[PDB]
């Protein structure tokens, strides 16, 4: 067992993890763009008469109310879920690491070499 490759292994793991995270972020962005385009169709603005825009904006406003209801729903859901998740994270913390927060220390430092100066 060599202490040599610990640094290389951990740095390589960090590189792999960063690559995976940025790849996941990019694919999430692509999926979000595709889902938005398939949920809110792009605006058509070519040669439309006044009544064409009237009707299109009416449809868009109906969709606006619909999606506003959808997203206030998912927003309340995300608020409740985030609150609950934070609460359970705090619960797990107090369950496991509550005995360790006091152990968070920067000790045995100044008094180790401040004895015979008196």
């Amino acid at each position: 067992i060599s202490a040599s490759r610990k640094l290389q292994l951990k740095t390589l793991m960090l590189q792999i993890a960063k690559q995976e995270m940025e790849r996941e972020a990019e694919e999430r962005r692509g999926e979000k763009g595709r889902v938005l385009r398939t949920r809110c169709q792009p605006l058509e603005l070519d040669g439309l008469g006044f009544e064409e825009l009237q009707d299109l904006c009416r449809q868009l406003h109906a969709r606006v109310d619909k999606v506003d209801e959808e997203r206030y729903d998912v927003e309340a859901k995300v608020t409740k879920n985030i609150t609950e998740i934070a609460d359970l994270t705090q619960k797990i913390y107090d369950l496991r690491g509550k005995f360790k927060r006091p152990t968070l220390r920067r000790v045995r430092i100044s008094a180790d070499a401040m004895m015979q100066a008196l």
Partner: protein
């Protein structure tokens, strides 16, 4: 209370407190710009909703991790 205030808030958000908009009452360029605003608002908000879905995924993962830890430790 039970939640009657909460449901009243929900209804107000969905119907009243939403960006209640009169749209089909504007000039050609004005109606066009308002439609552009509505379309952009829908786009940004749908992106936000996808983000909320992804956060639901992450919260589910955390729940699974916490459950496995609890079952292993208790």
């Amino acid at each position: 209370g039970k939640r009657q205030t909460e449901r009243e808030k929900k209804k107000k958000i969905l119907a009243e407190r939403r960006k209640v908009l009169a749209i089909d009452h504007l000039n050609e360029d004005q109606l066009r710009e308002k439609a552009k605003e509505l379309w952009q608002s829908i786009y940004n908000l749908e992106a936000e909703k996808f983000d909320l879905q992804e956060k639901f995924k992450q919260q589910k993962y955390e729940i699974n991790v916490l459950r496995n830890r609890i079952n292993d430790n208790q």
